[PDB]
Design a protein around this ligand. Structure first.
Ligand SMILES: [Mg+2]
Ligand SMILES: [Mg+2]
Ligand SMILES: [Mg+2]
Ligand SMILES: [Mg+2]
Ligand SMILES: [Mg+2]
Ligand SMILES: [Mg+2]
Ligand SMILES: [Mg+2]
Ligand SMILES: [Mg+2]
Ligand SMILES: [Mg+2]
Ligand SMILES: [Mg+2]
Ligand SMILES: [Mg+2]
Ligand SMILES: [Mg+2]
Ligand SMILES: [Mg+2]
Ligand SMILES: [Mg+2]
Ligand SMILES: [Mg+2]
Ligand SMILES: [Mg+2]
Ligand SMILES: [Mg+2]
Ligand SMILES: [Mg+2]
Ligand SMILES: [Mg+2]
Ligand SMILES: [Mg+2]
Ligand SMILES: [Mg+2]
Ligand SMILES: [Mg+2]
Ligand SMILES: [Mg+2]
Ligand SMILES: [Mg+2]
Lengths: 278, 152, 121, 140, 155, 121
RNA sequence: CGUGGGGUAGGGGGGCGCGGCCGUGGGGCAGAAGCCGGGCCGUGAGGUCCGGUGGACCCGCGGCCGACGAAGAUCCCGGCGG
RNA sequence: CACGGGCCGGGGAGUUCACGGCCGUGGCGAGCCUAAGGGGUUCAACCCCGGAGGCGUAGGGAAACCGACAGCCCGCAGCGGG
RNA sequence: GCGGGGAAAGGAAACAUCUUAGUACCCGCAGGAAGGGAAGCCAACAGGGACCCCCUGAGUAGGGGCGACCGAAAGGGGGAUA
């Protein structure tokens, strides 16, 4: 049924890393293995970096705001070309006391910008809904591969397994202090520390515009629903994002347009996933 | 999705930007006028290539009249072969009432208002349609069905 | 009342254009642990007559009385954090209040006690 | 310094000969005008260009005929493969028989001392220890 | 949940017999009469009433009967009555100068034809489209570019 | 024009490599012919409707489609069909007529020489 | 493998640089950018390192976007010559 | 002995939208896509809803009006036989 | 925002009908919005049900040296509802 998804190319092409197992491991809030649950169909999608990049660029581009110059910039002085015969170039010049001073033309100081940004420019790269959801499924499946997650840059040495599923009881944790303990016992804290230490002051004019800090991404926490206490308990950690499962998107699933995000699923979130993005 | 470099990138350092040195990049005179003009004098050779000889018809002139669309039926026909596919799907979901021992479909609730005769009917069918072509009535009747003409 | 905007230009414009009653908030300095248990508050705006310990800079570790506060500059002058000019006069280094710790509080002002009760609560 | 096999040894010597005879590729009249004095090569698309047309007595244009042997292209003159290093941990995975260490220009003196010590212990040829580091280690 | 009236979309000649339903402006007086209400009482219960409509649809009657029972048994809360809740008439200045008297209304075309077909409405509508470059005013001469291109590409 | 680049889909790219390797290993020109049709520009890729199989295939025939099998028309023959991809409606029609739907690598493994296999585009 | 190697207009294919953004990895008061001179690498666009000057920011790699590359326009503005 | 530039620095020219043709890829496929707008959000992002409508599935004719294939041959690839 | 007066340049590769454009501009008069608004309506024998604005119908019908070019309405989906 999914033979066309996981394409077997044996014997002529050597196999890659095996598909994720038919079951997922579930850990309790103390980091102890608890049980197994059936793998949702989403994790069997092939990882498709080309499609994931397209869907990420689409979601990011919907955020950009229109920019432009003032419509009359450099065009409102009283100027005219004074013709030939005066020994000077025939560009427009100030009419009054500043007379010979050049004006209007893009090559003159204080002149108009020839081809400035326009607020009507289409910045949003649109994507079909079906194509966007196929990319989301592809990005979800990448969270189950240590090869993809490590290649994105996460610290995965101490994580017991991937996909990392924790019990639904974790959704009751309300304090950042307790969520910190949960991250440490699941082997996720080293990646949070990578983001905490990796925050830098970025180079260039972005500092002037409120973009002084560039922060790495660490962990995506997926919960069953909105307004569970765990959302507030983890959202203050450096590089951590948290969403309910129905709010999954390409911005959190493939930062940089690159698949494989270190993700902590709750068991209830994995259950709800089976009816979404399909 | 594949991305390609803009042509302006290649044209930096080329003086003419692909417009040549002799016939450079000028204003509307380089197009022989502004807009869709010139087709009877200097672009008449373009009319003769694509249009009717002698009259240049589609480019210039009148032909016939238009029957007013507000008093004309907009037809949405369906072929007999395509209909046979449709009822098969409809039966699987259970949308077909086999009212009289035969499958009964009426085209208007299906969004069509005419029945044409292309294809093959493989089942007996009662079809309620405002209009059916001669071959549609025959092909439906050869399969044990029947066409019933309703009045608009 | 100091902007809520996250834009650095608006944060800085709030700071430089703040009226006098807002500039007082920039005079807050941490109380020493001893004063914190006696008064029950963590911070107070520095006041002339207070005694502060300087924690940063060339005069780090120097304790002295506050002799003058400049709301416009948001700077304070502290006894001991001085030097001499070429003409031999004694001049004061202007110290930012966030770099000192209050070790003795001047409480002769009734109006100041109201601020303490508000923060102790 | 780096020990190369005989096929590459000849190509390295050949590359040195090609370097000595390589023209300095300049635009026409680059020597006359200060405004273009420090310019890179430009292949100007002009009517009367005599460099593009390869007139004898004029400067020579850029062509792929001037490319150096592909097997030694990019090597340091000593024969090594240069690697830019910014911290001591960057020395991992390099082979002193193949690689030479070039320290990043902006690496500060404190970090440069750690890199040079670790690299010299591992046997790497360090291209640019710097004047200050050389004095400090010599003083040591 | 207060029901919404269901009415039939007018069947045009162009449709060829295909019909569909739509949400109506309000319940008809015939439908209200079958549930024992007049226009005033139905409006006091928060129902949209359309005294212009002549048709009576049984599905509308059935929805009204079901919801009225819920309301009269305390299970449903009627919304606010569908009658005016404010009166806001502003003092008028210069009616004659702005063409708002009967003489002005006649010259503007508002006595003989609809507002949408008056010449000043046409002037304002097209001016807005050109200012915003909306719909067909993003391209001048769009029709002729399409016409000539169709001939060339469909020859 | 922007000249043809080949597929960006790595799944398609790996399949094309597979078919070329299978053609070399088994001396089978068919898998080379399939790979060339699969690598066609997207705007001229091969799509085949199940209704076309009625005319071009007999009962029991083994058919390889170097492209997508779409479900249009009706199938009345029992066919073994391999394709790059199959739509759900096409899948249902082929199976319900008693046929079988394979991947191209499945067909190559089953029939390395591609004997009796009919190319349908 | 080629009795392959000139080329204006023009068409086609690949790369360099500049400003920002999304990621990733780093450097910096034991001295960032900039600037003067110099060595090395690349056919080249250019990269990189050294000494001096300077005093706080900047860079590698992958992706994406442009207010993106000047020798010339009796070019514009400023400065300054014979 | 055709015209332009004294010099240096800085600035300085294919842009955006709509519509059409075509190409390179990507999704879905006898179907494809939603528009305005609506609900939620960690609030211009994002998730979900919205199929009105547009294009395609059938053409001919000014219009009334009418309304469609697996039969034979040649034959590239490919497959089979010698 | 409402009423009135009202061009030309340019385009049509000339130009006058035409367009540009009921635009620029001028004169008068309002509000925090204005104007519109409660069927001498639309439809076609089936039915909608005041109005304005948004998406569509649609560059369709239609106007036009039937040239350049100009260009609806009903209907459908919404905001809101008296
Ligand atoms: Mg300006
Ligand atoms: Mg774009
Ligand atoms: Mg900079
Ligand atoms: Mg030309
Ligand atoms: Mg000529
Ligand atoms: Mg010219
Ligand atoms: Mg003629
Ligand atoms: Mg006639
Ligand atoms: Mg010449
Ligand atoms: Mg330096
Ligand atoms: Mg128009
Ligand atoms: Mg050549
Ligand atoms: Mg980059
Ligand atoms: Mg030039
Ligand atoms: Mg000058
Ligand atoms: Mg002089
Ligand atoms: Mg001349
Ligand atoms: Mg001169
Ligand atoms: Mg104009
Ligand atoms: Mg003219
Ligand atoms: Mg004229
Ligand atoms: Mg109002
Ligand atoms: Mg009013
Ligand atoms: Mg008009």
């Amino acid at each position: 049924l999914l033979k066309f998804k996981l394409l077997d190319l044996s014997p002529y092409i050597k196999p890659a890393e095996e598909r994720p197992p038919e079951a997922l491991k579930v850990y309790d809030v103390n980091g102890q293995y608890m049980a197994d649950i059936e793998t949702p169909i989403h994790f069997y999608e092939p990882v498709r970096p080309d499609l994931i990049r397209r869907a990420y660029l689409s979601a990011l581009s919907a955020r950009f705001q229109p920019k432009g110059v003032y419509e009359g910039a450099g065009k409102e002085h009283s100027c005219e070309s004074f013709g030939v015969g005066l020994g000077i170039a025939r560009i427009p010049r100030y009419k009054g006391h500043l007379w010979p001073r050049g004006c209007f033309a893009p090559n003159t100081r204080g002149g108009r910008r020839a081809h400035p940004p326009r607020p009507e420019k289409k910045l949003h790269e649109e994507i079909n809904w079906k194509e966007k959801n196929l990319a989301i499924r592809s990005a979800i499946a990448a969270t189950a591969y240590k090869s993809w997650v490590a290649a994105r840059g996460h610290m995965v040495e101490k994580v017991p397994s991937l996909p990392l599923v924790v019990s639904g009881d974790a959704e009751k944790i309300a304090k950042a202090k307790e969520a910190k303990k949960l991250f440490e016992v699941l082997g996720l804290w080293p990646d949070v520390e990578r983001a905490a230490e990796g925050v830098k002051i970025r180079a260039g004019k972005g500092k002037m515009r409120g973009r002084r800090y560039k922060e790495p991404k660490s962990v995506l926490v997926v919960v069953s629903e909105l307004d569970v206490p765990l959302i507030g308990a983890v959202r203050n950690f450096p590089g951590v994002d948290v969403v309910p499962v129905s709010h999954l998107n390409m911005l959190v699933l493939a930062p940089g347009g690159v698949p494989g995000r270190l993700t902590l699923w709750t068991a209830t979130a994995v259950e709800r996933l089976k009816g979404l993005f399909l | 999705v594949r991305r390609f470099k803009r042509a302006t990138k290649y044209r930096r350092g080329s003086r003419t930007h692909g417009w040549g040195r002799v016939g450079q990049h000028r204003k509307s005179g380089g197009s022989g006028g502004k807009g869709m003009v010139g087709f009877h004098k200097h672009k008449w050779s373009l009319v003769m290539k694509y249009g009717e000889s002698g009259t240049g018809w589609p480019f210039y002139g009148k032909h016939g009249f238009k029957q007013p669309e507000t008093i004309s039926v907009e037809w949405r026909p369906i072929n007999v072969g395509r209909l046979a596919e449709l009822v098969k799907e409809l039966r699987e979901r259970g949308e077909v009432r086999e009212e009289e021992g035969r499958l009964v479909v009426d085209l208007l609730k299906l969004g069509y208002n005419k029945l044409l005769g292309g294809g093959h009917m493989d089942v007996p069918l009662v079809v309620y349609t405002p209009v059916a072509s001669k071959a549609a009535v025959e092909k439906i009747a050869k399969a044990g069905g029947e066409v019933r003409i309703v009045s608009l | 009342p100091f902007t809520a905007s996250a834009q650095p230009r608006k944060q800085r414009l709030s700071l430089y254009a703040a009226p006098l009653h807002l500039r007082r908030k920039l005079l807050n300095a941490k109380l020493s642990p001893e004063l914190q248990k006696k008064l029950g508050v963590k911070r107070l705006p520095v006041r002339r007559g207070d005694t502060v310990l300087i924690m940063r800079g060339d005069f780090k570790g120097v304790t002295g009385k506050v002799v003058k506060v400049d709301l416009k500059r948001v700077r304070i002058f502290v006894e001991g954090a001085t030097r001499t000019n070429s003409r031999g006069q004694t001049v004061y280094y202007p110290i930012h209040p966030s770099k000192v710790m209050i070790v003795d509080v001047d409480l002769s002002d009734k109006a100041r006690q109201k601020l303490i009760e508000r923060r102790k609560r | 310094r780096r020990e190369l096999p005989q096929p590459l040894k000849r190509l390295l010597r050949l590359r040195l000969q090609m370097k000595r005879r390589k023209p300095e590729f300049v635009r026409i009249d680059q020597w006359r005008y200060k405004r273009i004095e420090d310019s890179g090569w430009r292949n100007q698309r002009t009517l009367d260009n005599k460099i593009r047309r390869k007139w004898k007595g004029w400067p020579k244009p850029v062509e792929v005929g001037y490319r150096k042997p592909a097997a030694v292209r990019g090597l340091h003159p000593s024969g090594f493969v240069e690697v830019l290093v910014h911290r001591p941990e960057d020395l991992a995975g390099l082979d002193p028989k193949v690689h030479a260490v070039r320290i990043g220009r902006t690496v500060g003196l404190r970090k440069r001392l750690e890199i040079v010590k670790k690299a010299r212990e591992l046997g790497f040829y360090v291209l640019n220890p710097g004047k200050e580091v050389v004095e400090l280690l010599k003083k040591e | 949940m207060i029901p919404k009236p269901v009415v039939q979309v007018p069947r045009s000649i162009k449709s060829g017999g295909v019909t569909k339903w739509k949400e109506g402006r309000g319940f008809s007086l015939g439908e209200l009469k079958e549930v024992g209400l007049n226009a005033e009482q139905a409006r006091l219960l928060g129902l949209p009433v359309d005294t212009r409509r002549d048709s009576v649809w049984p599905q509308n009657v059935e929805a009204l009967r079901k919801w009225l029972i819920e309301v009269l048994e305390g299970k449903a809360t009627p919304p606010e009555p569908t009658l005016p809740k404010v009166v806001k008439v502003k003092r008028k200045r210069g009616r004659a100068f702005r063409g708002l008297t009967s003489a002005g209304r006649r010259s503007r075309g508002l006595i003989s034809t609809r507002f949408r077909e008056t010449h000043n409405y046409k002037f304002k509508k097209k001016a807005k489209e050109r200012r915003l470059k909306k719909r067909h005013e993003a391209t001048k001469g769009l029709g002729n570019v399409l016409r000539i291109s169709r001939i060339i590409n469909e020859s | 024009p922007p000249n043809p680049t080949g597929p960006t889909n790595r799944q398609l790219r790996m399949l094309i490599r597979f078919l070329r390797k299978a053609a070399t290993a088994n001396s089978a020109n068919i898998w080379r012919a399939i790979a060339e049709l699969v690598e066609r520009p997207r705007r001229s890729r091969v799509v085949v409707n199940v209704g076309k199989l009625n005319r071009v295939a007999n009962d029991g025939d083994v058919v390889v489609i170097p492209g997508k099998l779409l479900g249009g028309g009706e199938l009345k023959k029992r066919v073994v069909v391999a394709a790059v991809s199959v739509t759900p409606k096409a899948w249902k029609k082929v199976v319900e007529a008693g046929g079988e739907v394979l991947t191209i690598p499945e067909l190559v493994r089953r029939n390395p020489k591609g004997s009796g296999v009919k190319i349908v585009i």
